Design a protein around this ligand. Structure first.
Ligand SMILES: O=C1C(Cl)=C(NCCN2CCOCC2)C(=O)c2ncccc21
Length: 134
């Protein structure tokens, strides 16, 4: 959850469940599927949301959840594709030109719900992460 309204992602998140497992995709992979989006526009980044949990008197544990943003949108809309940034993982179809922003409008209000994150057959899924909505 967010105490500052976030940029809304078109897709559900990917939640870490095993610590020590790295968030990664094979180059050319990792752009979630949206109906009718052309492969030339399939370019962007996953953004890590670090979560925090209040102290109790039990065991006293919350793992990061990542959200996808098309290139030129979201909290890292101005950063160059492939630039080394903590918490940002760039992904793009081999059909995409990562020099130009995706021609994709942002999501919300009550106009559209988040698309459950899906990847095409052949996609190497990052071990230790759970895809929300799966
Ligand atoms: O801020 C988070 C929560 Cl609070 C938003 N609330 C709505 C929950 N989803 C939106 C549509 O239906 C699936 C879940 C989510 O839309 C989501 N937006 C992208 C990054 C952060 C998250």
């Amino acid at each position: 959850e967010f105490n500052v309204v976030p940029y809304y992602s078109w897709f559900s998140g990917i939640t870490q469940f095993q610590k020590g497992k790295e968030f990664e995709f094979v180059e050319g992979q990792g752009v979630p599927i949206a109906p009718g989006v052309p492969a030339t526009e399939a370019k962007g980044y996953w953004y890590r949301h670090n979560r925090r949990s209040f102290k109790t008197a039990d065991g006293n544990q919350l793992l990061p959840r990542w959200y996808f943003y098309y290139l030129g949108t979201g909290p890292h809309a101005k950063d160059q594709y492939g630039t080394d940034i903590d918490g940002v993982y760039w992904v793009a179809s081999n059909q995409a030109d990562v020099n130009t922003p995706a021609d994709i409008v942002d999501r919300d209000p009550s106009s559209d719900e988040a698309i459950p994150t899906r990847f095409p057959p052949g996609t190497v899924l990052p071990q230790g992460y759970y895809i929300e909505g799966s």
